[PDB]
Amino acid sequence: YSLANFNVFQSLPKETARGVDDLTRMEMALLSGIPEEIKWSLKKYLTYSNKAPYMISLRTLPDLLPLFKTFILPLERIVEGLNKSSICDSKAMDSLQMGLNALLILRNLAQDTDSVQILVKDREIKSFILFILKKFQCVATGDNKWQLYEGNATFFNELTHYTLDLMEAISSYI
Amino acid sequence: NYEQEAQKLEEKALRFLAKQTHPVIIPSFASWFDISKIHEIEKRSNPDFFNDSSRFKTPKAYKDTRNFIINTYRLSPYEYLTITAVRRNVAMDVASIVKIHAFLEKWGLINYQIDPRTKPSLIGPSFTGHFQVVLDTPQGLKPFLPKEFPVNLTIKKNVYDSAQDFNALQDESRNSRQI
Amino acid sequence: YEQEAQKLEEKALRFLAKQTHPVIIPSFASWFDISKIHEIEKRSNPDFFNDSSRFKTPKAYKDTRNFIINTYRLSPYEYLTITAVRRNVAMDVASIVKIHAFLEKWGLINYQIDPRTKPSLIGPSFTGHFQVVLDTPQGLKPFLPE
Amino acid sequence: SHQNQLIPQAYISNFHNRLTNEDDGIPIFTMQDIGNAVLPDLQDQHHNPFNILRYPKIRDTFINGKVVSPYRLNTDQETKANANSGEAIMIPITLDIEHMGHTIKDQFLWNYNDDSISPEEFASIYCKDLDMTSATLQTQIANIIKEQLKDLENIAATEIMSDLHVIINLTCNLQDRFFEDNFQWNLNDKSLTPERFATSIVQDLGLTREFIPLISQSLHETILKIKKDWVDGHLIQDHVPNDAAFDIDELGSNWCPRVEILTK
Amino acid sequence: STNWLYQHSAACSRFNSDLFYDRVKVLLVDQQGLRDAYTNILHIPESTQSTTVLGWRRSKNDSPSDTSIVYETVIHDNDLNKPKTGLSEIPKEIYEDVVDEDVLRAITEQQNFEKCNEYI
Numbered sequence: 001y002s003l004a005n006f007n008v009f010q011s012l013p014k015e016t017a018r019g020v021d022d023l024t025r026m027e028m029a030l031l032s033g034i035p036e037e038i039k040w041s042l043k044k045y046l047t048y049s050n051k052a053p054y055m056i057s058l059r060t061l062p063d064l065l066p067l068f069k070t071f072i073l074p075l076e077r078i079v080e081g082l083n084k085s086s087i088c089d090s091k092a093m094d095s096l097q098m099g100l101n102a103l104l105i106l107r108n109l110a111q112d113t114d115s116v117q118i119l120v121k122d123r124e125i126k127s128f129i130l131f132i133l134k135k136f137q138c139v140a141t142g143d144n145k146w147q148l149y150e151g152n153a154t155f156f157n158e159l160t161h162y163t164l165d166l167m168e169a170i171s172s173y174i
Numbered sequence: 175n176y177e178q179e180a181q182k183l184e185e186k187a188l189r190f191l192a193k194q195t196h197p198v199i200i201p202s203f204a205s206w207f208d209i210s211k212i213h214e215i216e217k218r219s220n221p222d223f224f225n226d227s228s229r230f231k232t233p234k235a236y237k238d239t240r241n242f243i244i245n246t247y248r249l250s251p252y253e254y255l256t257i258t259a260v261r262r263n264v265a266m267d268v269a270s271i272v273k274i275h276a277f278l279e280k281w282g283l284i285n286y287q288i289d290p291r292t293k294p295s296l297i298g299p300s301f302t303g304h305f306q307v308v309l310d311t312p313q314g315l316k317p318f319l320p321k322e323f324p325v326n327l328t329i330k331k332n333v334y335d336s337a338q339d340f341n342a343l344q345d346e347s348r349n350s351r352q353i
Numbered sequence: 354y355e356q357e358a359q360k361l362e363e364k365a366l367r368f369l370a371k372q373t374h375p376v377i378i379p380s381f382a383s384w385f386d387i388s389k390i391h392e393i394e395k396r397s398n399p400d401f402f403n404d405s406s407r408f409k410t411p412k413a414y415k416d417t418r419n420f421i422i423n424t425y426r427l428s429p430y431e432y433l434t435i436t437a438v439r440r441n442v443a444m445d446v447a448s449i450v451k452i453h454a455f456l457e458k459w460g461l462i463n464y465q466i467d468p469r470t471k472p473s474l475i476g477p478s479f480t481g482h483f484q485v486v487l488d489t490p491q492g493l494k495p496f497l498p499e
Numbered sequence: 500s501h502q503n504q505l506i507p508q509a510y511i512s513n514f515h516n517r518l519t520n521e522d523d524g525i526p527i528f529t530m531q532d533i534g535n536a537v538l539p540d541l542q543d544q545h546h547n548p549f550n551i552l553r554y555p556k557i558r559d560t561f562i563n564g565k566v567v568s569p570y571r572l573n574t575d576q577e578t579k580a581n582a583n584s585g586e587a588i589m590i591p592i593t594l595d596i597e598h599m600g601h602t603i604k605d606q607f608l609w610n611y612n613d614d615s616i617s618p619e620e621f622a623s624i625y626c627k628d629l630d631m632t633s634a635t636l637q638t639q640i641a642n643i644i645k646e647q648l649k650d651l652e653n654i655a656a657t658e659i660m661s662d663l664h665v666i667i668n669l670t671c672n673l674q675d676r677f678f679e680d681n682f683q684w685n686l687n688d689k690s691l692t693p694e695r696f697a698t699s700i701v702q703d704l705g706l707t708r709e710f711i712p713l714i715s716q717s718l719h720e721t722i723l724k725i726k727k728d729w730v731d732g733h734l735i736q737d738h739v740p741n742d743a744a745f746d747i748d749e750l751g752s753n754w755c756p757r758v759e760i761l762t763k
Numbered sequence: 764s765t766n767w768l769y770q771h772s773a774a775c776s777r778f779n780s781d782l783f784y785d786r787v788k789v790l791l792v793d794q795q796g797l798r799d800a801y802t803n804i805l806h807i808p809e810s811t812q813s814t815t816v817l818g819w820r821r822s823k824n825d826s827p828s829d830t831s832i833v834y835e836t837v838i839h840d841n842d843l844n845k846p847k848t849g850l851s852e853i854p855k856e857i858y859e860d861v862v863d864e865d866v867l868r869a870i871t872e873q874q875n876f877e878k879c880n881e882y883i
Contacts, residue, residue: 002504003548003561004291009507011566012289019288019488020201028281032203033215040490187838190811192478193543195551199508202487205496209481210815219575227584229689246802248480249540253560254512254567258628259801265694265712267589267610268621276572285569286488290505294492300499304833306820307482308883311840314810316468320430325840334832340495341486342500345546349500365768372769381850381869384862396857400688406662408685413748420750424772431783436703436755437775443741443752445664445685446696458849465846470783472702473810475790475797478540481816482836495832498819513803523800537798540805556803705786707797708806750771755778 023055030067035094042071042101049108059114068102069124075099076128079135079159082152096155103162110169119166120173129170132163179317184327186315191329196251197343199290201282209244212237219277222270231270239264240274247284254285295338366419373426379460387419398455401448409448417442418452425462432463432470506548511564515630526674527605528629570624581614588612590651590723591716592644598636603629606716609644611652618644654726662687664739665725666753671717673709680756683741686725693718700756813838818883841880851877 015021020028026044029037048056058064078086078096087093106125109115119125138146139156148156206213212233217224223236242264247255261271278284311325334340339349384391390411395402401414420442425433435453442449456462463471485496518528533553536542544550551557588611596603622640626632663686671678680700697715701708728734743749786808790797796807817839824831850873858870 003506003551004503006561008511008561008564008566012507012510016287017289017292019286020282022490025201025203025490028201029203031215032206034203034205037203037205190541190807191836192480192483192540192812194480194483195539195544195548196506197486198483199486199488199493200496202489202494205487208816222582222584225584228586230587230589230692230694235694242476245477245480246804248483249477249804250802251508252506252511253564253803254509254514254569255802256512256514256628257570257624259514261607262712262801263708263799265697265715267587267608267613269610269613269616272572272616272621272624273575276570276575279570280574282488285509287507287509287569288488289507290493291502291507293488293502296489296492296494298494298497300497300821301495302824302830302832304820304822304824304835305497306835306837308817308820308837308839309479309481309813310815310817311838311843312811312813314468314471314473314808316840316843318430318467318469319844320465321844323840323843325838325843327838329836329838331833331835334834335830336500337495337832338500340484340832340834341493342504343484343546344500348546361765365765368765369768369772379869381866381873383869384866392861393858397853406664406685408662408664408748410748413746416750417748420768420772423768424775427772427776428780431776431779434703434779434782435699436782437778439682440753440755440778441750441771441775443683443743443748443750445688446682447685447688447691450691450695450699454849458853460846460848464848468810469787471810472705472783472786473808474698474702475705475708475806475808476812477802477804478807479812479814481813484834497832498821514801517800517803525800535794537794538796538803538805541795541807556798560803703782705782705789707799709799709801744767750768 023061038098039094042098042105046101046105046108049105053109053112053115056109057112057114058109058118065106065118065122065125068106069122071098071102072106072128073124075103075159076131079132079156082148082156083146084149085151087152100155100158100162103159107162107165110166116169116173120170125166126170129163129166132159133167136160136163176323180325180327183311183315183317183325184329187312187327188329190312190315192249194343197290197341198248198251199288200286204281204283207281207283209241216277220273230267235266236270236274239266239271240278243275243278243284290341295336295341297337301337366423369423373423374429376426376429377465379464382459382461385459385461387422390415394455398451408444413444414448414452417444417449418456421452421456422461429465430467430470432466432472434472509569510566511560512567513560513564514628515565516559516563518629524674528601528603530601565630570627572620577615585612588652588655589719590648590655591719592647594640594643596636596639596643598631601631606713608712608716608719609648611648611655618648651723654723654730657726657730659686659726659729663725663729663734663736666740667718667721669714669717669721671710671713673713675762676758676760678706678710678714678756678758681753683739683753684722686722693722704756704758706758817881820883839883842876845873845876847877847880848873850874 022044026041029041032038045056056064074095078092078099087096106119110119135146139148200207206215220236222228223231224233243255243260246260246263257272257275260275261268264271275284306328333346334344335346339345378385384393394414398414401409401411421433421438424438424441435450438453439446439449453462487494487496517523518525521529531542533542537554537556539551539554539557552561589608590611592607592609594603594605618641619637621644622637625640626637665684665686667682667684669678669680669682693715694711696718697711697713700706700714701710725734741747741753742751744751790808791811796805798804799806820837824833850870858867862870
């Protein structure tokens with residue numbers, strides 16, 4: 001009826017019967033570059049940061065922050081290019097949404113001591129926070145250099161909020 | 175004339191074609207992989223074969239080794255394909271063999287351990303059509319000709335009703351009135 | 354005195370030619386002269402003219418090239434392998450392989466041969482046409498392109 | 500088509516039993532219908548894996564097999580600004596070890612310039628494959644590897660700058676087959692590597708793939724030896740016996756390779 | 764004494780034929796392939812096997828709702844008469860500037876032919 005009915009196949013562990021632990025699956029999916037896997041893994045990482053942040057703490061899992069930085073710096077480039085209609089394509093929208101999701105994940109993790117301690121010791125994240133804050137200041141003081149195009153305001157809105165939260169946390173370490 | 179040539183060519187190509195018996199399962203994140211091409215993920219994870227540093231490490235050698243390992247695994251996907259067997263068959267330095275084996279094993283391309291009798295089967299968006307995987311013609315089987323001569327033969331065909339039939343590798347021929 | 358040796362070698366090569374089969378040189382190799390070099394060889398195969406060693410000299414290079422071409426033309430319906438040439442030629446194996454691959458590239462050695470006579474390694478078969486099955490986080494899904 | 504009909508994947512391993520058997524001659528660790536076919540790789544089973552059991556070897560793999568936990572290497576944590584990208588230090592390594600009632604004769608290459616893997620890890624992998632895990636065996640293997648590394652280390656890293664041509668006799672025995680060949684090798688041209696040479700020889704003679712490492716490896720050996728005799732000045736360069744017609748570099752030059760099965 | 768080169772060359776050709784016949788006898792005639800024991804797997808000369816995969820092809824069924832899959836392999840041999848050589852590898856900076864116009868056109872044709880045969 002089936003070759004699985006051998007005695008040899010009576011001693012299989014329960015750990016591999018599914019194929020891969022979900023943490024490894026999410027890490028490898030982020031490592032791939034396939035957009036569908038990227039979106040799936042980012043949704044799962046966001047849920048974990050919201051409902052179980054101790055399983056993905058930036059200390060117990062090193063080399064987790066580099067991936068988020070890879071998703072976050074193109075967000076800096078986009079935000080600089082956000083003073084005009086520039087989200088015409090769907091790949092641009094996908095990159096923007098991936099950046100926003102990674103930023104929210106970072107903020108949710110920064111709500112913890114070890115994760116924010118790891119975040120402070122990173123020049124890239126602090127420089128990005130400063131860049132977003134200077135853009136917000138340019139919007140606030142009403143400078144003629146960089147004027148937000150209202151068709152994008154929504155995006156910017158969310159962005160600002162996350163940044164400020166991050167700042168709040170790291171405000172204790174400067 | 176050419177009709178008999180193409181007929182004998184199809185006969186020979188079908189005689190020396192690897193008939194698949196067991197299904198191969200790989201995790202979804204390993205979907206960028208092609209047996210005949212090299213991806214950026216492979217060049218980043220193995221910079222020594224492509225940075226032109228050594229002469230013993232060439233992209234051709236890497237590709238031949240990894241294709242040997244892939245074919246050996248795919249031909250019998252129930253066993254484990256230990257490193258020692260590969261090392262006895264391949265002629266590289268042991269460090270490179272180990273690195274390639276570990277890289278292929280991390281991405282589930284080989285030695286991906288599941289128990290596929292505990293998961294459902296779905297249908298992707300791409301479905302319900304004729305799929306023709308076009309592979310190059312083998313040499314040493316081309317005819318001996320002592321005008322053009324194009325060839326677009328078809329070697330073997332398989333039909334499936336559902337995706338579960340595709341996964342289980344069950345064709346309509348035997349499935350129709352099995353018991 | 355040496356002119357007499359050249360005469361002997363010329364007569365020997367003429368006999369070789371007089372007992373060789375007729376072959377069909379491809380068009381893109383028509384620049385080839387059996388008694389010349391043509392400076393395509395000089396560029397593609399350096400180090401036979403840099404006076405690098407006492408061994409690799411243009412005269413010996415030309416001799417080996419002509420010998421290999423005639424040994425092939427003795428029976429054009431068979432792939433000429435490197436082991437035989439290596440058996441009947443005095444030169445470093447590297448240079449023999451260089452000349453063999455060069456003459457092969459321009460279709461001067463194995464252009465029209467019985468393809469069953471070409472040697473190839475024995476690896477496992479080719480599992481490229483096989484059917485793969487992805488393991489999504491939900492269930493097994495048939496891998497198929499779009 | 501039922502879920503239950505599928506087979507698990509990548510659990511069994513019959514390798515050790517293939518090592519132990521005498522019908523399967525492994526030179527290491529010793530003490531429709533089917534015609535003259537052994538494996539089903541080219542004969543199509545009619546979409547029924549059960550027929551796979553018609554062949555005794557597949558049955559042996561499915562009956563005398565063990566369940567194996569996978570290797571878990573160090574996940575290839577490469578380095579920080581290391582691997583200075585030297586060409587290669589390719590030194591051969593042999594193993595003659597007498598375990599209790601067991602022999603182990605093996606060979607391989609080792610890149611001394613690559614610090615990615617350590618001899619202890621290789622010993623662990625080897626002993627797991629042979630299914631003979633014992634700390635004493637692994638310590639012996641690692642010590643042998645370290646000794647052979649320290650011996651031929653400095654000699655291998657000596658690039659020759661003057662044209663040398665040497666007549667070389669390669670002789671390699673797998674278990675009972677002896678491969679002997681003679682040729683003329685230049686120790687200055689980095690174009691041809693012994694691996695390509697071995698591949699060409701195996702292609703032309705139609706031998707098994709197992710000869711590709713062996714030959715090449717042995718070739719490496721001889722090269723190193725010659726280097727010693729060229730460092731100690733004990734290597735002459737005045738002549739080299741190649742049967743050349745009358746000047747040098749002519750058309751007789753040597754004999755050819757052969758493979759012979761012997762006894763006694 | 765003008766028969767030495769010819770005898771050596773004929774011996775070379777006979778050696779070549781002997782090697783070919785021995786390979787064919789061992790690998791393909793007596794048994795179809797050699798079963799290696801390290802991996803427990805058949806080994807057939809790579810020539811009999813195909814090398815790469817030239818993309819895919821897709822179409823539709825005859826009727827809608829006919830949810831079936833037709834998986835099938837296909838070999839493609841654009842211009843089986845003309846053999847392939849390594850001519851797609853020689854850089855332009857070698858054969859140029861010393862060639863006849865016709866030979867240059869032939870070189871370009873061969874290179875383009877190989878490059879296009881690498882396609883579907």
